[PDB]
Amino acid sequence: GRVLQDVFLDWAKKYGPVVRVNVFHKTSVIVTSPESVKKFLMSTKYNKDSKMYRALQTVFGERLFGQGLVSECNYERWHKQRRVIDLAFSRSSLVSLMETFNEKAEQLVEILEAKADGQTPVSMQDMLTYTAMDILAKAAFGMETSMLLGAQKPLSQAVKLMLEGITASRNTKRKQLREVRESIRFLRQVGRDWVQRRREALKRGEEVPADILTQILKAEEGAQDDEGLLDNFVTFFIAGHETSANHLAFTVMELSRQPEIVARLQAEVDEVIGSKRYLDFEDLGRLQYLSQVLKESLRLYPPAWGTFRLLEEETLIDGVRVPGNTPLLFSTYVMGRMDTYFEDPLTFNPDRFGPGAPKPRFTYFPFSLGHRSCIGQQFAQMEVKVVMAKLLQRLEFRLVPGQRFGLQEQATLKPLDPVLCTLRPR
Ligand code: HEM
Ligand SMILES: C[C@@](O)(CS(=O)(=O)c1ccc(F)cc1)C(=O)Nc1ccc(C#N)c(C(F)(F)F)c1
């Protein structure tokens, strides 16, 4: 259960802060000094490398993320979508999402409580993925997928294959090619239909609370076809649930072998929310220790391990001449595991993020940094606190003997094993 990132870690440690590599069968330079991270990520002068993102824009010759918000590299084209889409992420937009967050988390916990007999194995990876998908579908596009309740099996199956498609396409077979193409076309069709269903409600003068769909449509205002829209549809559908689910899955997985931390987490949910059923916005800020545990989870287990920038002009980086036209790779996974940046890096220790501790300085970036940072950071941090808070209040988890703690790389990092647990009530 090692990943290509673990090899980059070995080389960063051994060959220093500037290392030429092969990723996606392409030359790049991995750059792992905090000073280089600041200089390149913190300036609008450096932009994403279209070359490295082509594997999201299209897969197996089927259009996927296209020139959506993640995969668009040109600053001006990106800046135009971002300025608009940003509105759906205001403090007030996010406050409004609390209900969706509580509703899905509650439904999750209820489903789990029904299986909490200590004998039924439950894939926490699958359940968390269904939750995150149901949350995203509702919060972003105003649709109920009810995957938690067994619905939309074809859609979840389509996301699954598509993800494996992204996995096979850039790294490594007859049916897979067909399945993946079909899955990508199904996803884009799903988006067609949900855009239509929104348009027809609007056509009949119905009222629509501003959301992500509202701003994606709005950014597509004046285009002859809606292919840009479906790009942004698939972008958010995927990016707005997969990393959250992976992050939750890693956190649950790790906590199963951290009883003392669970005890403090439990003690904390009690003090701040009690046995209350609904979490208020202001409740989130007070779950400070849960916050540290999630931060520490992202340090060791970042679903999105890093990012690429195009270095346009030959530049000196930490004493090494790097030629112009070179993709720079930045890895929060790598830096998180280097003892030069984090003491005893392999130890899961949430006190690293405790009150009074200096904040890691450009050595930790699970949502990236600068202008290309994650638009959904706060959205994500909120949903996962809501979900974990409810789990911690009501349930205890035990990993099914034989479950491993390792990682795998699909389109993101996620647990190698499905996180099979048996459940008991707290
Ligand atoms: C804990 C979960 C999350 C983490 C770890 C996370 C991680 C990241 C990272 C590292 C970036 C940079 C990608 C790159 O440079 O190529 C990114 C991009 C972004 N993610 Fe997130 N993300 C998560 C949750 C969310 C959610 C919930 C949303 C949507 C609701 C979302 C939407 C976005 C989008 C659209 C981008 C592109 C931003 C831009 O270039 O303007 N993510 N995410
Ligand atoms: C194809 C690849 O899986 C591989 S990668 O190793 O070149 C890579 C991983 C993570 C990155 F942030 C950037 C690149 C990939 O680009 N995945 C990727 C990148 C960003 C995002 C975001 N946001 C996602 C996500 F699935 F949408 F979350 C996947």
UniProtKB/Swiss-Prot annotation:
Q: Does the keyword Transcription apply?
A: no
Q: Which SUPFAM superfamilies match?
A: Cytochrome P450
Tissue/organ expression: Expressed in brain. The mRNA was broadly distributed with higher levels in gray matter zones and lower levels in regions rich in white matter. Not detected in fetal sample but its expression increases linearly with age.
Task: Give me the residues that bind heme, please.
Answer: 374
Task: Give a GO cellular-component term.
Answer: postsynapse
Question: Reaction catalysed by this chain?
Answer: cholesterol + reduced [NADPH--hemoprotein reductase] + O2 = (24S)-hydroxycholesterol + oxidized [NADPH--hemoprotein reductase] + H2O + H(+); cholestanol + reduced [NADPH--hemoprotein reductase] + O2 = (24S)-hydroxycholestanol + oxidized [NADPH--hemoprotein reductase] + H2O + H(+); 7-dehydrocholesterol + reduced [NADPH--hemoprotein reductase] + O2 = cholesta-5,7-dien-3beta,24S-diol + oxidized [NADPH--hemoprotein reductase] + H2O + H(+); 7-dehydrocholesterol + reduced [NADPH--hemoprotein reductase] + O2 = cholesta-5,7-dien-3beta,25-diol + oxidized [NADPH--hemoprotein reductase] + H2O + H(+)
Superkingdom of the organism of origin: Eukaryota
Biological process per Gene Ontology, one example term = regulation of long-term synaptic potentiation
- Gene Ontology MF annotations: cholesterol 24-hydroxylase activity; heme binding; iron ion binding; steroid hydroxylase activity; testosterone 16-beta-hydroxylase activity; testosterone 6-beta-hydroxylase activity
Per its UniProt record, what InterPro entries does this chain match? Answer: CYP46A1, Cyt_P450, Cyt_P450_CS, Cyt_P450_E_grp-I, Cyt_P450_sf
EC top class named in words: oxidoreductase
Task: Give the membrane topology, semicolon-separated if more than one.
Answer: Single-pass membrane protein
**Assigned protein family:** Belongs to the cytochrome P450 family.
Function summary: P450 monooxygenase that plays a major role in cholesterol homeostasis in the brain. By promoting constant cholesterol elimination in neurons, may activate the mevalonate pathway and coordinate the synthesis of new cholesterol and nonsterol isoprenoids involved in synaptic activity and learning.
Q: What is this protein called?
A: Cholesterol 24-hydroxylase
Organism, scientific name = Homo sapiens
Q: Upper taxonomic classification of the species?
A: Eukaryota, Metazoa, Chordata, Craniata, Vertebrata
